[PDB]
Amino acid sequence: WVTVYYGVPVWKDAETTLFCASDAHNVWATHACVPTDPNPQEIHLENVTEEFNMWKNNMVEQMHTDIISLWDQSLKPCVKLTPLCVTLQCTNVTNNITDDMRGELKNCSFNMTTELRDKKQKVYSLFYRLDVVQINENKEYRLINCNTSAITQACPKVSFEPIPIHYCAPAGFAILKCKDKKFNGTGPCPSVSTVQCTHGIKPVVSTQLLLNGSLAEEEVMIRSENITNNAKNILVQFNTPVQINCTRPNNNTRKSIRIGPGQAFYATGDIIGDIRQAHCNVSKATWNETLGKVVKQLRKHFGNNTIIRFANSSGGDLEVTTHSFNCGGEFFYCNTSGLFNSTWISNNDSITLPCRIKQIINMWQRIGQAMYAPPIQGVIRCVSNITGLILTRDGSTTETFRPGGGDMRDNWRSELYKYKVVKIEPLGVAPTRCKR
Amino acid sequence: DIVMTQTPSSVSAAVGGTVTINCQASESIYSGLAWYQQKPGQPPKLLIYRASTLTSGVSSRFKGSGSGARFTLTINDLECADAATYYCQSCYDTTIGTYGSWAFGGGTEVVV
């Protein structure tokens, strides 16, 4: 009566270690990944439904951990800049500088160490206002992190380009994927297929806007753990890109300073041509249409005649109040208020966002490990696809939404929401009419 | 460590016509075989080397072939040219990797 069957096609929810694969000096060491399958297979499961939950998906946690650990390993061999924690004697840059950019750059000089222990050298360099603090309340200044953390120079040969990786299941596991074009992140998913590896995902880091991800295939999607709870984020995925063009219109020079045997510091040298403010342009008509689509869908949760208003972010550190990104190797902090300034009532041009630049970066919102971004010579221009927003509710007929930042995890759960990891359990039994 | 077996030990003929001598190696010697003709009273003379090449001290009358571990010698016409004992010699010892270790089989007496 009891018949034992091996190879039974059943599974259970499971948490395991995933490995990366890559389709082939990068900060994320993507060369360390397993080469991908040039033609991966996908199997449709007929008559199979499954329950998914993107808010409890541990694939997000592994991606978060791998990214931070790789980032830290990439700085391990790079030169430390601790000899720079000196008193800087410093004044402003006033040569051909545009107003409202005036006061942003400073010309500082100091006594730096050199190749021999017995010698000192006088050097000078330019710094951005956001990287220094005044101590002598020319005036004495110090680098902003000298009383809290060590500063490590990023290696100039290492790229920050967000080259995508694929996550792949180990033997004994499978990754289930949703195909439902309207899936909102939780509950039954009527159309499921299996893959061994995920689509390539770019480890892009941003705050208020998501700059280079996937677009919704059909309708604009609004996803949240609750919607109702004002303590939760709302992730909005666009079904069309919004093009954004960013620039740093200052032709800079770069020079190296030897600070000890085998070690050098890269300093901003001087500026060729006039000094101008960094900025980003967003097409105006596209932005307007894009919000109109978002509002029509937000209203489904708030009421047919509910008014929706957008407002800018709350006060706080640039890292949480501005739109930040790494592009061309520079770290931009842009003012987004020009994008969130409207009230939506029931029934060519551009928006220019001014930006600030910082060289001393606390990359993962951790304290004690500061990275110094060496300057880049020449002029930087970037073009990217805005694919979505992170919004919060500002919380009786009007709702107000504000952009905001969030955990790094929220920028990855937006791509991994369709995937689930299960383990295969091949043994099972059933009654039959046979006996040995 | 290469052992050569030679057969028949005694071969004879009427005057006129051919006879053959066979030789079997215990292991392939990759054609490293030499044939010698020893008449009573002297050292052996080399007739054929590397299985089938003549030394030119011998006419086309003496022909042979083979490969691997198995070889033969044919004497095309016997005019009482000799009453020699013919010997099969291995010139390569595959167990050592050299040409410094030789082996001989017993010989064959040819009578005519």
Partner: protein, 122 residues
């Protein structure tokens, strides 16, 4: 397809059992992780094979045993189980008897082997 039979009924699915069987074996970040994963995959494989060995089903995808169905585990008819149900549904229906059945299978095999020795000694 590896899980292609997931939507098939039990009597239809258990014909493609080798498809899943063939896919069970298949110091830096992404370095040490692979070594650890490989070891655990091997351990899982071996535990399942050891059980088939213990129950007398080694080398088979389908094996009959001599253990009776006790009815209370599932009082469904064979024509209902094999034709109108999938393996996922079945696994849920009798999930809580897994340990009962395995214990019964193990004892039966020990008794069988002892009896075979008594006959070979005759």
């Amino acid at each position: 397809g590896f899980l292609g039979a997931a939507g098939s009924t039990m009597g239809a699915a258990s014909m493609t059992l080798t498809v899943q069987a063939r896919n069970l074996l298949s110091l830096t970040v992404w370095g040490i992780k692979q070594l650890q994963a490989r070891v655990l995959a091997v351990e899982r494989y071996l535990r399942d094979q050891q059980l088939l060995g213990i129950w007398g089903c080694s080398g088979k995808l389908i094996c009959c045993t001599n253990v009776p169905w006790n009815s209370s585990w599932s009082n469904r008819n064979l024509s209902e189980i094999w034709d109108n149900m999938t393996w996922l549904q079945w696994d849920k229906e009798i999930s809580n008897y897994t340990q009962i059945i395995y214990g019964l299978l193990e004892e039966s095999q020990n008794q069988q082997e002892k009896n075979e020795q008594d006959l070979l000694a005759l």
